[model samples]
Target: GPKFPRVKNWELGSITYDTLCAQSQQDGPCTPRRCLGSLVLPRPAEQLLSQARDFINQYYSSIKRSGSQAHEERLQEVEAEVASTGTYHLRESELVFGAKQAWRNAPRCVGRIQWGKLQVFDARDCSSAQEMFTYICNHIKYATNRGNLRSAITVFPQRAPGRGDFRIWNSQLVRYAGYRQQDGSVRGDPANVEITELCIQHGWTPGNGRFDVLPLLLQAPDEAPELFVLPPELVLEVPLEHPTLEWFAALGLRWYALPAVSNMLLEIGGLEFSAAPFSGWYMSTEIGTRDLCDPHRYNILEDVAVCMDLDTRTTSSLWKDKAAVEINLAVLHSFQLAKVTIVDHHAATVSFMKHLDNEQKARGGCPADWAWIVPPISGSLTPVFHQEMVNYILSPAFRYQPDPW
Candidate 1:
């Protein structure tokens, strides 16, 4: 039931209101003591939840085996309404405008998809381009100071760029290992690296919230008002496991927020979509180095990661099966490369995940890249056969390529 009933309390009171009169009237305070509509509870539908989950599972499996029209057809099927419960669809006008509203609220990394929340009647105000840009810029400005913490930069599942928001808890005591290492940086180590530093702190930036109010913070006359809405714990993040240039290249971590909408996890958990692509591993990774022009002089590295707009599944990803595989592979590649860099004494502490530092690893702080995979138990499934098959299929692209194996 992707479409929601006008009343969220329908589950707790009216799923079968006509048949049951034992409870107080639907219009009255149904929960006895609770006043009016304040105490309503949703008696969620279990069957619908089950079917939604099944549909998602199969959708990914189909995509993994085949990556063409058949897969797309399967995707459409997976997206189709389940059992057609006779629920009305969001109006065409509404869907169109709502899409725009969500985009406005979206942050910037490639901006692939930053899904907005769904309201009972309709809520589509996050769709303005101007609105989105202002929010992101403000957020970036606010978070950079907080992101320079050594603890925040440590590698861990929670620090996985996708796991939770990265918050620079305090502006004090945070070390800047990212401080310029004899090389110039467009972000991070600068003496006055404001925006980049801020992004790494707040994780999602001001663009993540609803409506638009950041413009006020900027245009205000003399003193800046307190803007403490962002959570300090779950904001900007950097994986200690991904401290190397190779890993960033592999993971395609982007700071830009994408435009997207979702009900993925909600469907998977047999519930309705509420949160976001928390589990959705959506991003395209590409890497480059600026040191080429000045071989002897220190060179800065830059990367671009394409973020994916995901469905609202808080735990599981709404990523296509193939897409998930790619993201996992990138993460896997990062884990593997970190081992080589750190052991070889060639990794840049300022550039990679803070957890890669030898002392930290010895203290049991470094995160295993595999830990980033979903349903940790699934990691047991070997991809050896899958790897070989892929080798055969893409031999043309590897005629003389350097071997990763």
Candidate 2:
């Protein structure tokens, strides 16, 4: 246990020592005082040479060329570049590998079984907000693929030492606008109120609708953020309806097809990409359970329960439970009916278990945050709920960054 973190699956009665955690150069929140394993963010860094050296080593090892002359020279080249310019650039192939690696290294993701299939869009040459919008639009068109939904990430320029970073103001490439009403209710997703208001302040005409897709606020280095409306043709949306419930379509609920997260920072080889946006297909629970049912979100559970004629008077009646299951079913059915890519919690978690097994064999162990790896609904029913996991930082990583005000 001293050499590695001992992981155990309570249901399966299996054990695996996570040797991969030893490679984590960064310490997580755990210490002799306490273990902050369940906390969302563990807060990094190096003398750049060492981090750059290690990442280069990882990259080389991945290509089965570790210790080769090319590998040694690449390390030396990175060192020399960093020493002189305080930063180094990734080769195109390295960028692709690092982008995929970042997705693979994301501990919070359940869709990482398709990590290797990501299409990396290098948008590093973008110099203006207009250009950034063009790149983002292209990314949306390609990734959405008219609802076929290819997993993709678009990497903008890396953050510079002296210059301001290029930033995407929206948390996701597509998000519903949250209009704070005079009656203290939110019109759309409450999670996006700040960003939605920011868009209005930046000269966007706000729509008074329940599911208005917000315009993109993109910022070039050292400049004010500019707003650009997404072309309706490029943005794919699916209307929610249940397979069995005829009245479910009457609820008038819809969700965007692409779940592209636009604001996370991509760190690779000690370089920071502040505007790298990545996306994958959504799991049904993300929209059905958390987004729709969470009180602070859309909070449609009571309405759903009422629609189902469930007794909402008491928690013992399990009205929320029945409604939630129907909502999840609605999401899956609607997506399938619309031919959009989506997975239910059961299928997503089942694949994640396979991903864990694959990672264990490939890297000795996988870094998984149990709180995140487990789906929002059916926690005990999912295969991942019984599996023990070690959480640690791994680079080429996707990290949350502060909002660009």
Candidate 3:
């Protein structure tokens, strides 16, 4: 656990900072949910209200409403709302801005340059588990877009007092099943063992395969959760294969096109979206280097190294690095052949550097998690590696929520 010092946003005259990191993972802390390099933590109510007002002012100012009656009235309304309810609701426009701002404030995400372009789906009216299932499926269909992935978030209701929270049990909208074997070994992703068993305990008959997709778990207030299987066509998956390596396909490697992370919280003002699932297109390393190669995950590096006839006798031979590079290459190549949206670490890092320059002018400064901005492979090869970055918690951010179970 490391402390995240707060920073100031001079544009809004807002100085809010209370962020924290829970755990560190193998491939840096920058994935959608599992690697929340620095998830914004709960702050004092007064601080939240102050920041919320600033956000409101910044939003109105952007639309040229500095001193207009409408602007003043809204500001007074926000003040009254916060005074009465201790939390205020974001207007439709404010919600959109907050959603995009959450992504922009995500220090770990490499694709924050496109933060303003995210599609925000408001599902706060959903009252049933069935309705939540529908929203989840809709998010998958819309974000997947048949391989042309889109960054979007389907936000459910916020956490309320004396009421149970609404939640989607699956970590992502799409994820492979992991079954614990008799010998205590896992068949697929070991990270998903708990969730997978929960699915089975909830009566989901699973398939025996490394690539079997899991069912969605939808839980509503005070009700037994229902498990619904995803439509096969709704999830677009790309089979992993290298351009010239034929055996790569025989290894039976594949991954879902869309990565809609479901287990994180989206905080706006002082409200918490405990079930807000968001997604961006993949960085090849998310799949190849971490999911497929990490020892705690698929642990395929040694197998692939053996397949490639690399020297695996010691760590000095850089056999893991060699295998990881090729694995990463295959992911990029396969996704491109399928016309799916994917970014290589090299391309992603360069754009991040360019984004840093633009943010420095447009806003005040770009906050980046150094471990995350730097790729796992070729750490020193990217511009982000050499540059210094400051990360802080900003209002309207994505925060880690506790497990729903």
Candidate 4:
């Protein structure tokens, strides 16, 4: 038999389902008896992303800006490669800055990416969220080089939308949700924190060479916004505010010391789909009665009757959350994030509760689900990603090859 390994741990909120349930039970006197649900998370990573990230870095180093005459030519070649791949290194500085500027220009939108140098400048409202992504990705993609475009465009969502920096490096990126700690065990995290801070504390930067850095990438339609859950790839990009001098000060980010923010271009991919995935994420719970002491519902002396929670007379009920949504992502993972989702949590076109109802149905929830279901919130819709990582990308022990004896 082939060897496969497994490791399980919580990525965010530190509290395991077991512990969480226990805590909730301890806190609530009316804790209902629950059964062990079923679902598993994908452990570590595979060769696809590690290979991809390495290839990009090598390509960048091969053509990095160094001297005068050669710098332009090498950069052009690099941009050409970027175009061919329909992928750009969001880890670079100037590109991040430009996108940030564009993002700030349109606060109504989450962020803006450019395909070419000439296409974007204080653009008006995007027709839709998809359109906004198309413009940014296409211009960046086309502008990168007119010659090469093979791979599909991958947009990484950047964090901290409005920060002034010239270049983005691997250091700027971090895991979306926290991961297992460095002390040989899963150190739980209550509040989501930066991987770097934990890395610093554990002295485990560039973790164990097991794909330490998360490439800025998007999640599948079913699970993009949930990247906060098992944050695989997230980047920094333009913010949804004006790029004023005071904006920098307001963030307490030093802009004056930033590198040259002049005419620099990033090679990002550009492509648009007529339609994108309809849902991001949704969750719902069944409404029903419970057996408990009720002050109401008098038990007749001659009739057999049961009591329930006094809070309310309950019946089978249904609720869900729905919203008309637009999702976006960027190329480089290094850039700061500045985009904000603008849909009424309550008054959205799709009522929030209704949306969750649909998702629960699709996911087949409550029918004895798995122990854990860590869906990567930052999912990539690309078929390649899904092909490589079908139902187990978020597991703590992905690719854990056990001894075949």
Candidate 5:
């Protein structure tokens, strides 16, 4: 075997050796027995000082200051702090660098091209649910930017020894309520049923509609979650409409402009930020194909197919495929019409290819999940589909955390 994983792009017949995977100290679930690379959640820590030392070294290298007196002093400072307190804090500048690096190192993201442009908001000063809500509101307003979505993250307090973690119960800052009906069907996004129920249980007034925006469940350290409804004006939404199909707008389909993921824990330099909420503009397939068409999701493909008057009688008619494309078209058209920031799958994947090239030159290789980098629909049509990638863990990184109930 080669010293590193041999990556190949079947489409272009190009090859690269992934030396970056060697940097992954965390072991992913795979061995000679089988490859579990396709599974979504592959499941990290270190002797805290050593991990902290590596991150500080990485930071200094980014600024071309590796081995400088200040860099060496910073490493010593981190070691001293860990030796005394068993934990250390990141300096403000280092926090910013680590946050961006986490996004850059995320294997599952197809939008790492914009990773360096993120606006990192440090909310470590937040001490209460009220303060958390206020910080979250500001993040929403700033990131939304009246539909000109900017990639941003608001990192709340880091988890500390002997203290409960601060958390946002919702998966995303903005999501539709999922009302599980008596007959067992869900009224909205099925993905949100648990969060929606949590909100209601925490004293939120539930709404009846499919597109009803859910409230935030913000928790401060060791405190029960508090319910805070977002101001309607802050949540920018675009009504889905097709350019040719006038009736598409009649479906009453709408999605929030900002796709802010709220529940992921951000790990940097062996420190854990349990309440870091991050946002980026949507990639159309996320809304059109996965959110709307996935069977366990909204499952609107059959309805869309019926509305398009496609023959649903046989699989040969490809009704699902036709309807899915139109729905994707509607998403792009509507977002463009509303002046919201959104990228079609083609543009997103093409830019991702460029990102891969950029990372390959900047680092030894880019860690990527082929299943996620490729769009949900048009799997082979995108440039990323044929690109063989090495998937591995890197820190600083964002990780899925258990729900703060």
Candidate 6:
């Protein structure tokens, strides 16, 4: 069921009211008074009181706090706040804990081993869209750190009364452009066609090559969005090639060093950070198999298959499989050769299995999305494929925010 019942105006710019209402209907109402909404539902006073009590209890238990007057006073305050305002805010300590928990709860990520190590940046006081860009730029630079990639998330201001929400237009901080051509073919990345068109509409001069970094679409409260090109020096890129096949270098394939996803919302307690951008170092399959090989994406497998002299006429020939192996190998070899941080699928999943064990001892269980944790190329080959997983919500989780436009 959806997490919230009613949606607010501030939420419309992030997740539209219509979408939320539909989701709420399907999912049923969320924790009555705990959900964010301008039109507060008829939440019983007792319900709000219950939520406050539960939060306080959870906080003390999580931090190993003993019963104290100060703790009771804080719970009373939350009860009073919720009763009056229909919502309550989380403490800074709770926010930090939630952020880490959210990462740990992410089912799709194979890099949950580093969930506890993420650096969370709070920019909730940001007043303008331009300020959001500064925070984003800072996050990218800090996370990238010249190839010593660190997992990090920068949380921008939450939705508020009479102000638009902050949003980063790009799906990722770094991505190539997709130019829909005159002859009905794409020049670069087809996945970015709409975003590319949006950029062009805003007067951004599109680049002709495959690896041009798209400018950020930063929208702030009640103002037209502004475009800002990232400084090339802050972004590290790797030129991809195979170790044995010199001709693979002639293909001119390359990719950005960082996979900083900016469009996702970081939900802590009940607050939604619509512009929170987070990054993890690349997994080889993410690039070689999914991004570069998917039909709707780069679709380079056929080209590589032809180059490998494989029979491309039929699926039985295993040309796609053969090309994918080389492509994956090239991604691994190139990153290693460049001294950039990238992990192979085998090593990553092995680490993820160990992460599951570490999590079991720490939290009684680990939340994982089996489909995502499994590598695209070899699903059954990884240990994650054999282990059953359970997916559920925990506070301080990352969520997919609706498109800001």
What are the candidates' C-alpha RMSDs?
24.4, 1.5, 6.9, 22.6, 1.4, 9.8
Comparing 2 and 4 by TM-score, which wins? 2
Local accuracy of candidate 2 as per-residue lDDT tens digits, 296-339: 99999999999899999999999998999999999999999899
Model 2 alpha-carbon drift over 4 Å, by segment: 43-46
Ordered from best to worst TM-score, the candidate numbers read 5, 2, 3, 6, 1, 4
lDDT of 6 at 163: 68
lDDT of 5 at 322: 99
For 1-405, candidate 1 gives per-residue lDDT tens digits of 323212112212422111111211113223547533322222223454344344334334433644557556544443464334311223333233333333222212122122222222222132322342334333333323333211001101111112232121222112121223345533232322343234335342433221111111111112222123333343333332233334434432422121112111111212222221111112222111111112222222111222334443433553333234344444444434432111111121111223223312332222111212112112223221111000001000001111111
Q: Which RMSD does model 6 reach against the true structure?
A: 9.8
Stronger candidate by lDDT (2 vs 3) = 2
The reply for model 1, stretches above 4 Å from the true place, is 1-96, 100-231, 236-405
List, residue by residue over 1-405, the lDDT tens digit for candidate 3.
325544443333444333322211113334455655454442255876777677787678768888899888998998898788776777888788888888987788989778878999999899998899899888888888888888899888887756888888888878899999999899989989998999999999988899899998988877878999988988899999998778998998999898788988888766788888998899888999999988999999999999999999999999989899999999999999999999999999889977876776666567678888888888788777776666656667787777877
Evaluated against the true structure, the overall lDDT of model 3 is 0.82
**Which window of 10 residues has the lowest lDDT sum in candidate 1?**
389-398
Local distance difference test, candidate 1: 0.25
> Candidate 5 residues 1-405, lDDT tens each?
678889999999999898888889888888989999877766622477788998999999999999899998998888888878889999999999999999999999999999999999999899999999999999999999998888999988888889999988888999999999999999998999998888888899899999999998888888888889998999999989999998899999988899999989999988999999999999999999999999999999999999899999999999999999999999999999999999999999999999999988989899898888889899999999999988888999999888666
What's the TM for model 5? 0.98
Q: Candidate 4's residue-wise lDDT over 1-405, tens digit each?
A: 212222122222121111111111112111248421221212212332343343334334434634445554545554665446543333344333333322222211111111122222322233333443443344334322322211122122321123221211112122222355557333222122344344344333433321233322222233221111112222222221122222322321110001111111222222111111111111110000100011121111111112111222233221100000111111011012222222221223123223223323432211111111111222222111121111211100101121111
Clashes of 3: 0
What is the Cα-based lDDT of residue 179 in candidate 3? 91
Runs in model 5 lying further than 4 Å from the true structure: 43-46
Task: Quantify all predictions' global Cα lDDT against the true fold.
Answer: 0.25, 0.90, 0.82, 0.23, 0.91, 0.78
For residues 316-353, what per-residue lDDT tens digits would candidate 6 score against the true structure?
A: 99999999999999999999999888999999998998
Q: For candidate 2, which ten residues in a row score worst on lDDT?
A: 39-48
Q: What is the lDDT of residue 95 in candidate 1?
A: 32
Q: Sum up the clashes in candidate 2.
A: 0
